[PDB]
Amino acid sequence: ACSVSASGTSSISVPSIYLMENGENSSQFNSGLSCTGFSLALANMTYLKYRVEQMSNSFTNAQTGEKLNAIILDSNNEIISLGQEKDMSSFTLVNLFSGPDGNLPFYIRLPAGQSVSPGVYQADSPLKVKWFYSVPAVAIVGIGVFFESPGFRRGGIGFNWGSGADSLGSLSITVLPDCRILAQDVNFGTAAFLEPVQSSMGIRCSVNTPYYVSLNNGLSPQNGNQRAMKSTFLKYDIFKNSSNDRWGSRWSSLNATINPVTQQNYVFTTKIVDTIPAGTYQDTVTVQVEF
Amino acid sequence: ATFLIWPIYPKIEANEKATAVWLQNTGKTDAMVQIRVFKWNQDGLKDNYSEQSEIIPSPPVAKIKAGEKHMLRLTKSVNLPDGKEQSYRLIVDELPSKVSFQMRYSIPLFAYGKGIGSGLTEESQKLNAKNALAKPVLQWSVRNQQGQSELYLKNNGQKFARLSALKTSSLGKAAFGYVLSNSTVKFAIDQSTASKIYGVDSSGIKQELIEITKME
């Protein structure tokens, strides 16, 4: 049949940087109204009008005061707004009911470059909707039977929307921690033996997400822990900043060029260790990021 | 290759048979990914990792081409003991004169037996409300090996602690420290406080100031 959810919570989870750079695509959630056993014959008009009695596009993280803004849409992907009814009655409305529970979907969309710390962003008010419906029922449950909100009259009795039925549900957005790593090649010079190379690695992480960065010993360690590039082999090593401190198995995210969504940048020098001829050697080093 | 992997703090609740981690390539070059899941314990006062069949990743290897989004399914092969938080490490290896770099993500993963949860969901918060020891209970002691000084932290609770800043006012070069449930670990220190340590735990839904008393 058709029913109306009197209590309930909907939740979506998005990682924070992806949220900033891409927003969030139309996510389906339960509107409050659900119908099973509806007819799919499209022979009888499905009457359905909703009135949003309470709603918020603002989502607040209780522990920081930070907020997200969201767009809410009504299953025809029309933006819904408080204080304005929308009649969705058609012959085909019945095919918008989704899932096994027959949930009439609404959608939430997060736009823009919204940047917020990970946490739970709860809707500033619950979503309360008043529904007015008369849905044709599948034939095996009866002929000419309809699932109807209270006081509905499809029409010596005039047409009447009735008093409606109220749904109430809460909306939450969980923002998840998130990290991006960017580590380019270290390109040594010509050949005919090679000056050192001071390069860097960058990590853009969400605000409260510590980690350790370790580097292994490449594909061809020579005595167990001496890095070497494959042609014979050419020994090298990697050092934090311009120092003599070997970077290996490590570097805490708290201890390298971090100014403020945060970004860490790690400066390192790659040096040749030996008269050894050319040339064109290579290695691949594993960068382990550990949370 | 620009790799995006989330969530980096996944968990499998007691009433869930599996959870998902997303692997998304937003770059223009393809990448190969290997996925393994290791059991994580702190026996011998240090972090140990071992092969395991309790949590099976699907797939164990994937090619993530440009613009692709794959799901990494983490499924429990068997049910866990009641009231227990099992710890694991999710390890995914990302493969896009020179030295090139490939990535390795070490990701903490927790799975829950009956009557205990992560506490990051409303439902799991209620589960832990009915459980007294569904939290970290931390004690410290300093005993000095051959022959430096080492701080010992013990957790008598059924849930882990993720500690960030210690002392009482801070130990630079320490981004975080894990004290797993019903475990003891030791670290590298110096100086003297000779009381109870002050710390910040990020295990739950919000950064909680946690107090840790001395073992005596």
Neighbours of A201 (CB within 10 A): 21
B95: helix, strand or coil: strand
Neighbours of A207 (CB within 10 A): 15
8 A C-beta contact, residue A167 and residue A32: yes
Alpha carbons B96 and A55: distance in angstroms, whole number:
45
- Residues in chain B closer than 8 A to A120 (CB atoms): 205
For residue A271, CA distances in Å to A238, A244, A250 come to: 7, 10, 18
Alpha carbons A77 and A71: distance in angstroms, whole number:
10
Q: Is A239 on the interface with B (CB under 8 A)?
A: no
Which among A15, A176, A180 has CB closest to B2?
A180
Give the pair of three-digit tokens for residue A76: 């025809």
Q: Are residues A76 and A150 in the same domain?
A: yes
Alpha carbons A215 and A237: distance in angstroms, whole number:
11
Provide the pairing of β-strand B161-163 with B150-155: unpaired
8 A C-beta contact, residue A193 and residue A183: no
Q: Is A270 on the interface with B (CB under 8 A)?
A: yes
DSSP-derived secondary structure for chain A: -EEE-SS-EEEEEEEHHHHHHH-EEEEEEEEEEEE-SB--S--S-BEEEEEEEE--SEEEETTT--EEE-EEE-SSSPBP-TT--EE--BSSGGGG-BTTTTEEEEEEEE-S-----SEEEEESS-EEEEEEEEEEBPGGG-SS-EEE-TT-B------B--S-EEEEEEEEEEEEP-EEEEE--EE---------EEEEEEEEE-TT---EEEE---S--SSSS--EEE--EEEEEEEETTSS-B----EETTSSSB---EEEEEEEEEEEE--PPP---EEEEEEEEE-
8 A C-beta contact, residue A38 and residue A135: yes
Alpha carbons A44 and A27: distance in angstroms, whole number:
30
What angle (nearest 5°) sits at the alpha carbon of residue B58, between those of residues B91 and B127?
Answer: 80
For residue A77, CA distances in Å to A70, A106, A134, A233, B154 come to: 14, 8, 22, 62, 54
Final residue before a domain boundary, out of A177, A192, A215:
A177
Per the CB < 8 Å rule, is A177 touching B93?
no
For residue A138, CA distances in Å to A96, A141, A148, B53 come to: 16, 6, 14, 47
For residue A234, CA distances in Å to A220, A268, B116 come to: 10, 19, 53
Backbone angles phi, psi at A181, to 5 degrees: -115, 135
Helix (H) and strand (E) counts for chain B? 1, 17
Q: Which helix (H) or strand (E) holds B127?
A: helix B122-129
Q: Are residues A137 and A79 in the same domain?
A: yes
Number of domains in chain A: 2
Per the CB < 8 Å rule, is A218 touching B173?
no
Q: Are residues A266 and A169 in the same domain?
A: no
Q: Are residues A169 and A232 in the same domain?
A: no
8 A C-beta contact, residue B138 and residue B212: yes
DSSP state of B149: B
**Domain membership of residue A33 as a residue range:** 1-177
Alpha carbons B87 and A43: distance in angstroms, whole number:
56
Q: Are residues A170 and A182 in the same domain?
A: no
Q: Are residues A155 and A197 in the same domain?
A: no
Q: Is A287 on the interface with B (CB under 8 A)?
A: yes
Q: Are residues A195 and A171 in the same domain?
A: no
Least CA distance to B108: which residue of chain A? Answer: A291
Q: Are residues A104 and A229 in the same domain?
A: no
Give the pair of three-digit tokens for residue A97: 């009911």
Neighbours of B96 (CB within 10 A): 17
- Residues in chain B closer than 8 A to A18 (CB atoms): 4, 6
Least CA distance to A214: which residue of chain B? Answer: B104
- Residues in chain A closer than 8 A to B93 (CB atoms): 286
8 A C-beta contact, residue B161 and residue B137: no
Which among A185, A236, A253 has CB closest to B100?
A185
Residue A161, Ramachandran bin (φ over 0: left; ψ between -120 and 50: alpha; else beta): alpha
Residue A150: CB partners within 8 Å, gap ≥ 6? Answer: A162, A163, A164, A165
Final residue before a domain boundary, out of A177, A197, A226:
A177
8 A C-beta contact, residue A220 and residue A234: no
Q: Is B169 on the interface with A (CB under 8 A)?
A: no
Per the CB < 8 Å rule, is A177 touching B9?
yes
Closest to A74 measured CA to CA, from A28, A41, A39? A28
Q: Are residues A141 and A191 in the same domain?
A: no
Per the CB < 8 Å rule, is A255 touching B172?
yes
Where does residue A161 rank: exposed (0-12), middle (13-18), buried (19+ CB within 10 A)?
middle
Closest to A31 measured CA to CA, from A57, A51, A1, A13? A51
Show which of residues 55-74 on chain A sit within 8 Å of chain B, judged by CB atoms: 63
Backbone angles phi, psi at A20, to 5 degrees: -65, -50
Q: Is B103 on the interface with A (CB under 8 A)?
A: yes
Beta bridge partners of A229: A234
Alpha carbons A79 and A47: distance in angstroms, whole number:
20
8 A C-beta contact, residue A206 and residue A260: no
Closest to B210 measured CA to CA, from B177, B187, B186? B177
Q: Are residues A36 and A116 in the same domain?
A: yes
Alpha carbons B161 and B158: distance in angstroms, whole number:
10
Closest to A117 measured CA to CA, from A23, A205, A22? A205
Closest to A25 measured CA to CA, from B69, B128, B1? B69
* Structural method: X-ray
Q: Which helix (H) or strand (E) holds B104?
A: strand B98-112
Beta bridge partners of A46: A90
Final residue before a domain boundary, out of A137, A162, A177:
A177
Closest to B35 measured CA to CA, from B9, B68, B65, B71? B71
8 A C-beta contact, residue A132 and residue A152: yes
Cα dihedral A150, A155, A161, A163 sign: negative
B114: helix, strand or coil: coil
Alpha carbons B118 and B15: distance in angstroms, whole number:
12
8 A C-beta contact, residue A33 and residue A131: yes
For residue A181, CA distances in Å to A1, A184, A265 come to: 51, 10, 10
Alpha carbons B181 and B185: distance in angstroms, whole number:
11
Beta bridge partners of B112: B85
DSSP state of B195: -
Amino acid present at A28: Q
Q: Are residues A132 and A22 in the same domain?
A: yes
Residue A10: CB partners within 8 Å, gap ≥ 6? Answer: A29, A30, A169, A170, A171, A172
8 A C-beta contact, residue A69 and residue A55: no
- Residues in chain B closer than 8 A to A283 (CB atoms): 99-100
Per the CB < 8 Å rule, is B9 touching A290?
no
Give the pair of three-digit tokens for residue B62: 């994937």
8 A C-beta contact, residue A274 and residue A266: no
Q: Are residues A270 and A290 in the same domain?
A: yes
